[PDB]
Chains A and B, each alone.
Chain A
Amino acid sequence: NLCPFDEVFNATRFASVYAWNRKRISNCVADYSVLYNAPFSAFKCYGVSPTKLNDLCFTNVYADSFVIRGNEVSQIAPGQTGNIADYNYKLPDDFTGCVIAWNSNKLDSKVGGNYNYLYRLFRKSNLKPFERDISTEIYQAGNKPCNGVAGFNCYFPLRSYGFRPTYGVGHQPYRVVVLSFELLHAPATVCGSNSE
């Protein structure tokens, strides 16, 4: 049983980062050298190494995916702070897996702006690792309660990226896949293609 990584990496539409998607991968064999060898702008593994992956077996693999700005890709790493790591998608200090990204300007930019991809600009506190906040409450920035209406110091919490193809590369959309490799006290049924 081949693992459905193509359905993660070559999916037609990606999620907004604040509402990032998670896919559980299980009971299958995956060739990870096929991954490391599409054109990727980021590929960093933390508790593992790509060549070593093709011989390991895991209980589950979780594939989280979303779109962010090129300059924000660096925040998808353990120990990072910033608008994306604080308020949208947070990795733990002890992350075990890989962070993979690529430029998706051809797919996700549109003349006049693609407003389908959002991020969260305001939040009272930072996310916990792998927490997902999809609320759309008006953010109270000032002293007066907002009562559900945007206004002076009362801000709708999400913004659209508005990706356009003429943007600089640091402002262009990037598709990101975060692979979590889970090893519980349980049968390890997701196996590299050179597994014993």
Chain B
Amino acid sequence: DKLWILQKIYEIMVRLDEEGHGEASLMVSDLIYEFMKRD
């Protein structure tokens, strides 16, 4: 459902940042905002 993929997207945002892809992490951050604004 929606909660599983939200968690996997959150985890990829964190992993991207820890592995030195900060710019990519910020892009996934934007997706998390847009995704959670939906019904």
A contact residues vs B (CB 8 Å cutoff):
69, 82-83, 86, 113, 121-122, 141-143, 152-153, 155, 159, 161-162, 164, 167-168, 171
Contacts and interface: CB of A to CB of B under 8 A. Distances in A.
Contact of A155 (B10, B26, B30): B10
Contacts of B25: 162
Contact of B6 (A69, A113, A153, A161): A153
Interface in B6-39: 6-7, 10, 17, 22-23, 25-26, 29-30, 32-33, 36
B7 A162 contact: no
Given A83-B33, A121-B29, A121-B32, A142 B22 contact: no
Contacts of B6: 141, 153
Size class of the contact patch on chain B: 10 to 19
A167 B11 CA distance: 22
Contacts of B30: 83
Nearest to A166: B23
A167 B3 contact: no
7 contacts: A83-B33, A121-B29, A121-B32, A121-B33, A153-B3, A153-B7, A167-B23
A116 B26 CA distance: 15
Given A153-B7, A168-B23, A82 B29 contact: no
A170 to B, nearest CB: 10
A101 B1 CA distance: 41
Nearest to B25: A162
A159 B10 CA distance: 11
B3 A164 contact: no
A162 B3 contact: no
Contacts of B26: 69, 161-162, 171
